[PDB]
Amino acid sequence: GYDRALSIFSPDGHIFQVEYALEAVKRGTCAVGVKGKNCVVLGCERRSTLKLQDTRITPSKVSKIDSHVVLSFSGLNADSRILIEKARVEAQSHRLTLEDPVTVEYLTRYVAGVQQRYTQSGGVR
Amino acid sequence: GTGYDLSNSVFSPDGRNFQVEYAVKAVENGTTSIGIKCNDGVVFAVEKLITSKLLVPQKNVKIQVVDRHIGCVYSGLIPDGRHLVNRGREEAASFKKLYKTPIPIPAFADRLGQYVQAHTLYNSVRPFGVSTIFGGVDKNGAHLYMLEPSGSYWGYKGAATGKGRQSAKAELEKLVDHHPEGLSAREAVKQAAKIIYLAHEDNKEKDFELEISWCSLSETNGLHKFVKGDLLQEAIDFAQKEIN
Amino acid sequence: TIMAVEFDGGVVMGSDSRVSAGEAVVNRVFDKLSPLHERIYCALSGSAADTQAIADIVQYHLELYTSQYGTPSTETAASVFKELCYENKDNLTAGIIVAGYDDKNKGEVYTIPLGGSVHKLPYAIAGSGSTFIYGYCDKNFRENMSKEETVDFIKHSLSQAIKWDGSSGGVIRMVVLTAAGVERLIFYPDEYEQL
Amino acid sequence: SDPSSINGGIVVAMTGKDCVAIACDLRLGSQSLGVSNKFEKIFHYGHVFLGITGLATDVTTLNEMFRYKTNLYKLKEERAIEPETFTQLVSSSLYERRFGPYFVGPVVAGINSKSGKPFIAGFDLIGCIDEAKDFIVSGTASDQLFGMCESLYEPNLEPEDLFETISQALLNAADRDALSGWGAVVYIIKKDEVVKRYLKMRQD
Amino acid sequence: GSRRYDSRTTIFSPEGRLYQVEYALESISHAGTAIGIMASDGIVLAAERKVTSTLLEQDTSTEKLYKLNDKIAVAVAGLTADAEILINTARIHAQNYLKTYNEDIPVEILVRRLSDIKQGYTQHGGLRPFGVSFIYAGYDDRYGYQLYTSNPSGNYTGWKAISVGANTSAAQTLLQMDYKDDMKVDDAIELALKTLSKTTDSSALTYDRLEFATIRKGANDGEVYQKIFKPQEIKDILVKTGIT
Amino acid sequence: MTDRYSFSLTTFSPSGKLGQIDYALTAVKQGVTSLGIKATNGVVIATEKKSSSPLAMSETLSKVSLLTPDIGAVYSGMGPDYRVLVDKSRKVAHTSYKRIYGEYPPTKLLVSEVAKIMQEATQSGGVRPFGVSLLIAGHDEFNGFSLYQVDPSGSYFPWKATAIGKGSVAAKTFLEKRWNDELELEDAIHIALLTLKESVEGEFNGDTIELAIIGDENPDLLGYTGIPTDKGPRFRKLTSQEINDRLEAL
Amino acid sequence: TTIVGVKFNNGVVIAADTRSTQGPIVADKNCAKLHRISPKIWCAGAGTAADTEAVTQLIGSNIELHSLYTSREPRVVSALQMLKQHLFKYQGHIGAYLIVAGVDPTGSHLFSIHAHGSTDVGYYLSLGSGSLAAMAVLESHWKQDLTKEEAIKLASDAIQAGIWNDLGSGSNVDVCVMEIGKDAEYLRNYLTPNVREEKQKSYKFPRGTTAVLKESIVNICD
Amino acid sequence: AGYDRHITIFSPEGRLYQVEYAFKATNQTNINSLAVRGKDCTVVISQKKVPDKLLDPTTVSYIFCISRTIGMVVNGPIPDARNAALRAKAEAAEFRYKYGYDMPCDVLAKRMANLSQIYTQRAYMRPLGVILTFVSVDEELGPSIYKTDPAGYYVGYKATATGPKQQEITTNLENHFKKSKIDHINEESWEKVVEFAITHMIDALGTEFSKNDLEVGVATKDKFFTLSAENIEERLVAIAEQD
Amino acid sequence: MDIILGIRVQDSVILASSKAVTRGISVLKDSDDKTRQLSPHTLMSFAGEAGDTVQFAEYIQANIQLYSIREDYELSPQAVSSFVRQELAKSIRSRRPYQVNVLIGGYDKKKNKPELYQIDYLGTKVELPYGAHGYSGFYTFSLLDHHYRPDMTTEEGLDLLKLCVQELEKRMPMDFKGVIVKIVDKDGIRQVDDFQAQ
Ligand SMILES: *C(=O)[C@H]1NC[C@@](C)(O)[C@](O)([C@H](CC2CCCCC2)NC(=O)[C@H](Cc2ccc(OC)cc2)NC(=O)[C@H](CCO)NC(=O)CN2CCOCC2)O[C@@H]1C
Ligand SMILES: [Cl-]
Numbered sequence A: 001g002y003d004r005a006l007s008i009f010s011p012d013g014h015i016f017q018v019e020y021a022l023e024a025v026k027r028g029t030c031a032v033g034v035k036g037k038n039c040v041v042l043g044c045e046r047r048s049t050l051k052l053q054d055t056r057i058t059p060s061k062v063s064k065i066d067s068h069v070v071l072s073f074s075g076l077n078a079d080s081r082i083l084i085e086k087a088r089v090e091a092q093s094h095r096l097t098l099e100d101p102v103t104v105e106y107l108t109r110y111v112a113g114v115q116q117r118y119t120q121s122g123g124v125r
Numbered sequence B: 001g002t003g004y005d006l007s008n009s010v011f012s013p014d015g016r017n018f019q020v021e022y023a024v025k026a027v028e029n030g031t032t033s034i035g036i037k038c039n040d041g042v043v044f045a046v047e048k049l050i051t052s053k054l055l056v057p058q059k060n061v062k063i064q065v066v067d068r069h070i071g072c073v074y075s076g077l078i079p080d081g082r083h084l085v086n087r088g089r090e091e092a093a094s095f096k097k098l099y100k101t102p103i104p105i106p107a108f109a110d111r112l113g114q115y116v117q118a119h120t121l122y123n124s125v126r127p128f129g130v131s132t133i134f135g136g137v138d139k140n141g142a143h144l145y146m147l148e149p150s151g152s153y154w155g156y157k158g159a160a161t162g163k164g165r166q167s168a169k170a171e172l173e174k175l176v177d178h179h180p181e182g183l184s185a186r187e188a189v190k191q192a193a194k195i196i197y198l199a200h201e202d203n204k205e206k207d208f209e210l211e212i213s214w215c216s217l218s219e220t221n222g223l224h225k226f227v228k229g230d231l232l233q234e235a236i237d238f239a240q241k242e243i244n
Numbered sequence C: 001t002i003m004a005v006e007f008d009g010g011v012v013m014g015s016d017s018r019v020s021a022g023e024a025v026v027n028r029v030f031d032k033l034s035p036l037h038e039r040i041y042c043a044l045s046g047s048a049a050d051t052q053a054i055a056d057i058v059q060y061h062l063e064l065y066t067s068q069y070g071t072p073s074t075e076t077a078a079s080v081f082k083e084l085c086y087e088n089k090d091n092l093t094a095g096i097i098v099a100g101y102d103d104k105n106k107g108e109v110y111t112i113p114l115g116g117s118v119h120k121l122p123y124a125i126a127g128s129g130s131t132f133i134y135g136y137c138d139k140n141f142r143e144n145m146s147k148e149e150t151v152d153f154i155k156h157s158l159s160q161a162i163k164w165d166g167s168s169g170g171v172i173r174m175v176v177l178t179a180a181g182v183e184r185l186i187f188y189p190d191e192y193e194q195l
Numbered sequence D: 001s002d003p004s005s006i007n008g009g010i011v012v013a014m015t016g017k018d019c020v021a022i023a024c025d026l027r028l029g030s031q032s033l034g035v036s037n038k039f040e041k042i043f044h045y046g047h048v049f050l051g052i053t054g055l056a057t058d059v060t061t062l063n064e065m066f067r068y069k070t071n072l073y074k075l076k077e078e079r080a081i082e083p084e085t086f087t088q089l090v091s092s093s094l095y096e097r098r099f100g101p102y103f104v105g106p107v108v109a110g111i112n113s114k115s116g117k118p119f120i121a122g123f124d125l126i127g128c129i130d131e132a133k134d135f136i137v138s139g140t141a142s143d144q145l146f147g148m149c150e151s152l153y154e155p156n157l158e159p160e161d162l163f164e165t166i167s168q169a170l171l172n173a174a175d176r177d178a179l180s181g182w183g184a185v186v187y188i189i190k191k192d193e194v195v196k197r198y199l200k201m202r203q204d
Numbered sequence E: 001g002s003r004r005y006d007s008r009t010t011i012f013s014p015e016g017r018l019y020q021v022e023y024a025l026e027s028i029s030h031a032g033t034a035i036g037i038m039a040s041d042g043i044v045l046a047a048e049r050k051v052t053s054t055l056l057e058q059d060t061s062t063e064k065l066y067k068l069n070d071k072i073a074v075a076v077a078g079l080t081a082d083a084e085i086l087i088n089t090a091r092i093h094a095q096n097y098l099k100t101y102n103e104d105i106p107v108e109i110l111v112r113r114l115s116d117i118k119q120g121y122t123q124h125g126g127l128r129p130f131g132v133s134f135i136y137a138g139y140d141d142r143y144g145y146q147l148y149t150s151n152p153s154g155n156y157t158g159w160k161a162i163s164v165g166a167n168t169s170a171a172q173t174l175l176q177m178d179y180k181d182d183m184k185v186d187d188a189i190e191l192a193l194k195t196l197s198k199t200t201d202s203s204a205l206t207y208d209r210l211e212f213a214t215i216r217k218g219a220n221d222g223e224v225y226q227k228i229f230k231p232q233e234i235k236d237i238l239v240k241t242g243i244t
Numbered sequence F: 001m002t003d004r005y006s007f008s009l010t011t012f013s014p015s016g017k018l019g020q021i022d023y024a025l026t027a028v029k030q031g032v033t034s035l036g037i038k039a040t041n042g043v044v045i046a047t048e049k050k051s052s053s054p055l056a057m058s059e060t061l062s063k064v065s066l067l068t069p070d071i072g073a074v075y076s077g078m079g080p081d082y083r084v085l086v087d088k089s090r091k092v093a094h095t096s097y098k099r100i101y102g103e104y105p106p107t108k109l110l111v112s113e114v115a116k117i118m119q120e121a122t123q124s125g126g127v128r129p130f131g132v133s134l135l136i137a138g139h140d141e142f143n144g145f146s147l148y149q150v151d152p153s154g155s156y157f158p159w160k161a162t163a164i165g166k167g168s169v170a171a172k173t174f175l176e177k178r179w180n181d182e183l184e185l186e187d188a189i190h191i192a193l194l195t196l197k198e199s200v201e202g203e204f205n206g207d208t209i210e211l212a213i214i215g216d217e218n219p220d221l222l223g224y225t226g227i228p229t230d231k232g233p234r235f236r237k238l239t240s241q242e243i244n245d246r247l248e249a250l
Numbered sequence G: 001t002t003i004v005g006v007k008f009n010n011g012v013v014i015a016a017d018t019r020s021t022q023g024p025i026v027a028d029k030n031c032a033k034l035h036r037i038s039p040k041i042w043c044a045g046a047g048t049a050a051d052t053e054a055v056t057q058l059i060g061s062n063i064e065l066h067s068l069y070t071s072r073e074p075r076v077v078s079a080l081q082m083l084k085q086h087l088f089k090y091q092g093h094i095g096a097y098l099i100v101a102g103v104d105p106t107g108s109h110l111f112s113i114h115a116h117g118s119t120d121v122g123y124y125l126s127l128g129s130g131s132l133a134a135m136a137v138l139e140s141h142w143k144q145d146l147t148k149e150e151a152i153k154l155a156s157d158a159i160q161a162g163i164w165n166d167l168g169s170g171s172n173v174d175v176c177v178m179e180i181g182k183d184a185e186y187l188r189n190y191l192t193p194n195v196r197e198e199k200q201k202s203y204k205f206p207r208g209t210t211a212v213l214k215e216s217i218v219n220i221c222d
Numbered sequence H: 001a002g003y004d005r006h007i008t009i010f011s012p013e014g015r016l017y018q019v020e021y022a023f024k025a026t027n028q029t030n031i032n033s034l035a036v037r038g039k040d041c042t043v044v045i046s047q048k049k050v051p052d053k054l055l056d057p058t059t060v061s062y063i064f065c066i067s068r069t070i071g072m073v074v075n076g077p078i079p080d081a082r083n084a085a086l087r088a089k090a091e092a093a094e095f096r097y098k099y100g101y102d103m104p105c106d107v108l109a110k111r112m113a114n115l116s117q118i119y120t121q122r123a124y125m126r127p128l129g130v131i132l133t134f135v136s137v138d139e140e141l142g143p144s145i146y147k148t149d150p151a152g153y154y155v156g157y158k159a160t161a162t163g164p165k166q167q168e169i170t171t172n173l174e175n176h177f178k179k180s181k182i183d184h185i186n187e188e189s190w191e192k193v194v195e196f197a198i199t200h201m202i203d204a205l206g207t208e209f210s211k212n213d214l215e216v217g218v219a220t221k222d223k224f225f226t227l228s229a230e231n232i233e234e235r236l237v238a239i240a241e242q243d
Numbered sequence I: 001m002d003i004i005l006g007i008r009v010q011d012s013v014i015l016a017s018s019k020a021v022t023r024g025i026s027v028l029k030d031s032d033d034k035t036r037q038l039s040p041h042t043l044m045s046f047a048g049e050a051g052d053t054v055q056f057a058e059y060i061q062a063n064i065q066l067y068s069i070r071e072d073y074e075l076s077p078q079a080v081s082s083f084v085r086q087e088l089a090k091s092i093r094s095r096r097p098y099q100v101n102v103l104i105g106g107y108d109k110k111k112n113k114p115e116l117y118q119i120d121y122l123g124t125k126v127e128l129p130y131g132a133h134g135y136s137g138f139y140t141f142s143l144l145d146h147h148y149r150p151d152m153t154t155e156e157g158l159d160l161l162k163l164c165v166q167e168l169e170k171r172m173p174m175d176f177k178g179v180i181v182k183i184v185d186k187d188g189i190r191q192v193d194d195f196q197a198q
């Protein structure tokens, strides 16, 4: 039922909900990636506002999508789980029908396409 | 506070629905139209304002037939009238298909009433911008009905809505008193022509075109027909004479 | 075996009283004449399920009609039956005669055979037993009979259909529809067999 | 063809003095070919036991299903489902697939924890309950089991006597059916403890 | 239309926060305190009953401690009714996992699914979030004893000791003070009560205002046991720890 | 047309309140007083039949209602909200229990089911919460007699005794004094009639008071004989006559 | 199966045999075919047993709910219409054949329903494989103005005719008597004219007669 | 904040303003109705006001024949009234089809009550600006009066009145039942129950009636019928020859 | 039908699967591998209807591979078998059922024990010391009933298959073009490449 347009243009040509989504990313714990000649490295900071955790079971910031591709993120942790699960299913789908793992560009292009759709679909931020 | 006139299904503190009342203004803003119940039938008449010499005369017909025995004329937003008749036709097709007999006028009037009223239950719809005068001949006699944007309707001896309603309602009140035994169909056509010429004086700036229709047990076999040729000219003259 | 006949004072409806499942009689004193309004009756032939389901739906349609538009015409009652039987013809095995009395058109008789077609008639016969009485009914029916002649015509006609058809039997029930109202008549074997 | 005769197998249940027994064969076959001599047909949810004969996939699926339902039952009710209640759950569960049924012949057995009353029941594949006091039979050698039980059985048997009577009923019935046998197990059930016994029977 | 009355429960602030989540967290901060403490040989759940009477039946009463599985329990902080909706779909996921794989659900898997459901009410549908925070205490054969926490935002994390509801800042400081990794269940129980005893907005901490649960692996078995402590058993353990 | 109200009308405020749920409790506070008492061998629920007009037949308006033969409900707040809740409650006792397990649900679970419907009206698109609080008194074989309170939020709690509506604060205080865990059912009907005299302004007799008990099985109210296991319903509304006999010993 | 209803001067009585059968085999020597739709409306079924049990409880539930909503006693005409519209919707695929009888505010009623959703009324009815044996006795002995005692006798005899002459029917006679004035009285096993004779032998086995391979205690407790 | 008065949600005092204003709407037609039970009948009187001379008096009615046995009179605007009339006619036909007996008065009241309760809780539906008075001689309960309002409220009455001068007609009727010490008009013929209804309506409103200022409906054992202008003039001539 | 054999020994499960693919009157291929790796220590062999056979295998594979990444963990052989049984038991009551029979051989690294599951197209699952699908079982079960021992080495296991395949090459009417043999043990899955004359 709920199809209210939440991402709309404002008078200065700006989509404020897409704008405000970036502000939630600024608030996110930092993450970095540097690619070498023969490697890529993902580095992610851990907060220190609350420390008495279990580091064995608390969900770590770098996720495996397939055995050859990984995904770090900044922003809302709960939102990131929904993108990861979608990407992990497209990985298996692609192997099944193409008989070949996704390229890194393809997997990226898919995740980028999902984020885009949630900027011009009714009922979703 | 205020804001009770911004949404359609909302009751103001005085128990009213202001969006319905605003629709009435659309109606009151429109062209004048009448009904006259005669002793075995009904007569419909409407004022058609001539915007320019470029309007093809006789060719923008405003009175609509339902089934073969019902006439409808409205005042206000012409498209909203058409939408209502399109529904009336579906409603009369439905009833006939099941019960075989053509739809009795009372049964038809409540089929319009319930629909129009349904457009005052929800803020997602706008009320109807028309008052509709319709009627005809069924198994047991002639019936004239008028139907408000609220979906309020009653039977009438005579009916009038739009710009010149007071003038028509005054003329109609005279006929009720001065013919208790009942007017005839032939007579009701002439009288209807007079009441449109007289009510035209509250719009006297633009030139106009008269349109009449009738449903009479004796004169049309209880089928709805338009008044054309000689009988139309004989009605325009009877009006043209008594305006002077 | 069911029939309706159009006479001077109105219309008359008669039926046997047998419900069978193969060659076993399930009920020998059933009533196959069912009221649809004050002066409109139906006679049911065919599937007990299919006819009873239809009669209940038509009754509802006329109770709702009455609530909104006052008394329906007999023609109207027939049109409701026709509509149901025509639109559900792939799943229905019902043969229905509809008999009504108003003050305008007096007695009328309508028949709706298996297809779903409607036939207005001076008299209609239907059901298994009817095949045996075509010759009798055609030689003996007159227009503008009296109540006493029409009951006699229907008593004799159904009498013969019970004699010959093993799918018919029991009492002959009748219903007489006139200005005066509804009169229920019954005739037992001991009266009609010796005709 | 007949889904009831592809895999083969039997279940019987009997009541005694303050005890019930439920026994089954171990055969899982595909027509003539025996496939498994370990396929058990008697499950338990708390203190209520269920035997299931018929199409083996459905036996497996119903056990999974009644485990699921009795588990949520215990979480909400904060107690173990009783035999009488479990019977109705099985009945309503089977009737729910009236026009695509599970090809099974289930058998409930257990003691009411509040009344101490020994209880048995069986069901057709669309969940018609059969609640006899004496004994319940099911599977490819039902006919045989009916004649063994009707002849051998008397009321108010002590657990150790009942064990002999249900064992001799099952054994002597399975040795007259091509699609039953290949071993058997018997559950003796009392208010407090429950003893499971594997029987030595003809391996043909 | 309806747009006028739409709160828009799934939108971002100019700062990039989710209004309805933030305000729901505010709701949960006024609810009775719940404490999870994980030891080497088991897990403790303790919670404080917000508002009580002499006449509130404490025997047939469960508002804060629910069994999801036979190996997993939750302590609730927030709207009881909202919690029961989520607890009930959590109990079903656990049975759908057992039916499918013939193995008990790993704790993180169940916790992720419940967190995923909440996350939904945060991004689509136009409905309010669930005003509920859970402490999940569970055992499985992959990670052993596990203590998780979830909140209206759909976010979850694992803990050695944690609090939700009222006075979490005060409670978290007192646990961080006296927690050690080599701790025993009997030590944890004692720690759990001391903490509540000092964050209570009431006079004394009595038995009738407490619920208590332990998930131990009784050394005389080799399997995991869930104990939801009875009134008399909270009253015992209250006198032993010297709070009488 | 079409319900385009697919969004919540109950949302968290910056203070963490749910506006509509608090306003519903306010509507429940204006309601007439109704109470419940749990004895050792029964439960009594009672309220006032605040007749709108003396021309109105107070009998034709059941504030107290049978849900299952061993459970009863009463209410404070908006009577129309109660009437549809009893309708849904009776039908969910059948579809979600009796049509599956072939016995009537226990009190706590049926209460659970009522609570759930009231919670959904707190969260579902295009609705307001119900403006009632319910007091549900029941018996089942495994939990004995019980008494529960259900609020507009969907929350419910079990009580030895309590009141809701107008004079609840004072009615609760009076029940604390007079309650013990040894009360016989008669003793509790007496305390309920005492507690309800403080709430009533005008006439106080059998025709202004509606009072029902969950107690012993009533074979004479079953309708049939010959099945020993069936001993009849535990729920019994008291007659106008029966209340007055117990008022003369007040 | 053999079931009958017999209208008498101040109410209605139904009766049934107590034999359940899987094809030619007697599954239950003594099962009750007499089910209630409401306290004073009783039911008896033949055909697919699971279909008659299921449809009897569904309409029994919908009638109980309806009674509470209307604050009135249930009417037989209600049970009848509900049963007929459901059976008809399912085109005979629900093999339920019922004799429904009861008293309500409007008096004493006796109907039959068949699987296709056909209904029948009369002062005496029978259903089942035993239908024709029962109906012979009813057609031979029935009269107008029966007493309660004469209606139980005639109902009982009609069930007997079925027990003796029809292989599908046997064991005992169950009777329910519904009188306009008073409570319905269900008489479980009103007749027991088929008791087994004392068997010739005891087939109690000497303990240890059965060879065992492996014994173990099972864990019921949690 | 200021939108809890447009839709059916609670105001901070726990009130539905839309229900309260819908009630206000019920007096718009400025008509008084009352109903009273006889020994074996039920009569409803309603004022009939025809301002316009162009109207067809015969078609102006606030009294409806819902079924063979049940009559309804509506206080409120006619479009809503007719909406409520068609729904009750539909439900009374569906009841009979499904349960094989005629819908009782109080059950139709309850069902129309529950329908109104829903507009009270769902935001997209507005309440109907009407009060519905249902009358019959029910085959279990005997002479019956049941009345529903926009709140979703309904109850059985010994007698009742509705409209602008409701409070004055009510107290008039209350006073008569205090004296008579019975809960019905002790009168064998309905003609004299209609005469009582009109007599007490005159005393309360302080107004005299001609045949065309009233509208009468009567419920008897297996029929509810409305009176003609000529059946009313007979009744008016009777009360006259007593004063 | 095609040949689907499995046998569980001391420390391994051995699956042997016919290399023939035959439409009507022509052997199309003589080197078909009728097996998919589900996880590093779980292997599934399959035979049945032309299309459904691989479509079902590759679908299960994708689902198990998905589960593995999401939980970063390998499901027990018992868990995989129960997932597969349930998928078939749905398929059996669907519009067009998968007509596929499977053996699942896996090594449970938690129990340190090999496991062999046989599951037919109805969702009939059983644990066996040795298993077969199609006509093959009519010969091999009585053979293994005689020559099988539970304490056999992987090397003995392979001689026990060489004995099963010879018996089938002797007595069955089809040319099934020999078998491909795979071992599942503590060290994962490897293909015995020299079974053409071992
Ligand atoms: C005169 O022509 C009479 N002919 C006799 C008769 C009995 O066939 C019948 O048509 C009579 C019609 C009335 C209608 C009102 C209800 C009572 C019966 N028909 C039956 O009694 C009917 C026979 C019949 C069955 C089926 C079909 O087509 C499918 C046509 C006719 N009896 C039944 O339906 C019994 C009723 C038991 O309560 N049921 C069955 O035979 C069961 N069959 C259902 C269909 O599938 C096979 C099983 O009266 C006319 C006027
Ligand atoms: Cl309702």
Ligand SMILES: [Mg+2]
Binding pocket: D174, D175, D176, D177, D178, D179, D180, D181, D182, D204
């Ligand atoms: Mg054998």
Ligand SMILES: [Mg+2]
Binding pocket: D203, D204
């Ligand atoms: Mg053999």
Ligand SMILES: [Mg+2]
Binding pocket: G162, G163, G164, G165, G166, G167, G168, G169, G170
């Ligand atoms: Mg016999």
